[PDB]
DNA sequence: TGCTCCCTTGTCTCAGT
DNA sequence: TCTGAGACAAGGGAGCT
């Protein structure tokens, strides 16, 4: 995601009762689930099979509210994202195969994005293969995503609904703005600028319109001492802070590389509608028995009301 | 003062009403008044309004006399070298001076003027050999005064106590601090405080990056002193097994010290810092101060001359006070 | 290879002391 | 060359007048 972006976007959120989600097709961004379950479920070191337990719980929550989910997994890691993150617990191919086997037995379709899952999710919604995106990753907006359902897996009666239109109307931010805002705040595709947090990054986009103007202002004022004498409080304070943080803004700011990565992510344009099956009780018993030692009786009480 | 020391000491404070101070002899640390007035009282343009030192000293004298306090004013003499060097570093640092690799003045005339003003009020004053706070502590110790009025936390490090803080905020009360309440409630004595300053910073030392009020207090409490703290840092340096057997406090503290690239060298703790606070240059004279009565005729003309106040304007304020 | 929340700290600026 | 409070931001660790 973009650092601090959820705080910025938060006040545009609207609460949606889960029951309204019945029969809705939702793209589910599952890209980091296995890793998170690994880190978050431990003992008195990581619990074995937390990926099975974790997926099972959430799949159940989705089906309980009659959501039709399509799961999305990461393909590869884009170069810009490697380079950025290039500045104990591992996700094995088995873990992935297992949760995928689990989804198939639930009758739930899944895909592996060519690259980032959030990017693929936005694509699914653009092609009308889904009606909404379930994700907690704020990168999704920069990839074109709207109709975002955040906090699906907190224990709450509701979920937070975000859309690009509300962001545009309430914060003045369009997609290009959010992409430029990322280069102040930081994201997986850029380190942003040291000293620029949610308050001043928003002020910069609002006062300067775009990073080109912001940079020209910065560079021009550094050159011409007379231009500085006319500067207001916002500019004067901002200038000092940037120089103190050793900020240099050159030819590669804003980044065309960063702009491309968000505007043209590698995605699958396939328009085949997803197929939702039914949970297979017999195969789900044997799966939970094999993997967790759940007696069929135990799977039954949970699964039978869901079918 | 010591950075953040008032945040640390604050909760041991006792709120005290001015009327409880009637007839008390109070040392007044006036060492930065003129400068503060110069900086805090400004033009619509942005300049210092002329003679704010006279206006400032005047209003504060009136508050003291109003509550029947018998003040003796204490001014700085020299500036100790250690204090001099650190202050220029802070000045340059905040002007923007890069410190590592990439990735309005007070004139003798102003002093003479506020001193003539005190004399015409009948109020005694002295000039300390060096720091005014240290001389204030010595006056109390010698029973030449009953309390100390200052906002500078260094006073405790110079052995002061019975400190009346925020006397000149525009408020209905004042905050009282003393050495014993601090020792009882915080476990801090004079030597502890002198070592805290080397973590937190003061006019005599830069302190350690990453050490704020919370961590500094914990270091003093957990290690007792800076020698033990330095010894602990140095002995668990490359013992990877001992570092596993360090509790949470030590483990986190070691990592923070490492992250902040902290070096504790042979001058840590500092003998020189210890001496500046323990043995400051003070005047041990035991002669009692003499309080006089305010001279209306001389105050009238003084205010006339320095501020253009008509006599009746001075009378309206001074007469009820007299 | 994750996240958000909370705690602590650094830095700066305006108004007051 | 001041003080004091507040706003903003960086970073770490725990637990999911
Ligand atoms: Ca992402
Ligand atoms: Ca001092
Ligand atoms: K930033
Ligand atoms: K410090």
Author numbering:
A (entry chain B): 2 to 45, 48 to 90, 764 to 983
B (entry chain A): 2 to 104, 765 to 983
Give passages from the manuscript.
Rad2/XPG belongs to the flap endonuclease family that encompasses various structure-specific nucleases involved in nucleic acid processing. The unique feature of Rad2/XPG is the recognition of DNA bubbles that comprise a stretch of unpaired bases flanked by double-stranded regions and correspond to the DNA in the NER pre-incision complex. We report four structures of the Rad2 catalytic core solved in four different space groups, three of which represent the productive substrate binding mode and reveal that the protein recognizes a single 5′ nucleotide of the single-stranded portion of the DNA and a 3′ phosphate group of the ss/dsDNA junction.
The structure of complex III was solved at 2.4 Å resolution. Two copies of complex III were present in the asymmetric unit of its crystals. The productive complexes II–IV have the same overall architecture. The phosphate group on the 3′ side of this single nucleotide is stabilized by van der Waals interactions with Tyr36 (from N region). When all of the protein subunits from the productive complexes II–IV are compared, the DNA superimposes very well at the H2TH module, but its trajectory differs significantly in other regions, particularly around the hydrophobic wedge.
